């Protein structure tokens, strides 16, 4: 019906980089991490995903809303 190969993997994958404790990630550090790894994640592509994720106050980003909208729409 509606798999969750990305949702579950995204929530879990991000969880590994949890800092806030509740379930958030810093875009500042998250940028260098992802870009520095994988297939050299572009700085532009990472800037978009993080911008739509949330980013409030300093740089807190909940991977629940980000993943939610990522699949919800």
């Amino acid at each position: 019906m509606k798999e969750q190969d990305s949702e579950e993997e995204l929530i879990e994958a991000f969880k590994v980089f949890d800092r806030d404790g509740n379930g958030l990630i810093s875009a500042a550090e998250l940028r260098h991490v992802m870009t520095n790894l994988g297939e050299k994640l572009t700085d532009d592509e990472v800037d978009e995903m993080i911008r739509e994720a949330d980013i409030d106050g300093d740089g807190h980003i909940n991977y629940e809303e980000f993943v939610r909208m990522m699949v919800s729409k």
């Binding site: 993997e9 980089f17 991490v33 992802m34 790894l37 994988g38 297939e39 978009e48």
Partner: peptide, 27 residues
């Protein structure tokens, strides 16, 4: 003490690929 951090970073990277794509079929 395997760096599982990078691993999760690979799969999550795949999500971004689908994210940028997904919402982009026609009109």
């Amino acid at each position: 003490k395997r760096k599982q951090e990078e691993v999760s970073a690979i799969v999550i990277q795949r999500a971004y690929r689908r994210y940028l794509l997904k919402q982009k079929v026609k009109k």
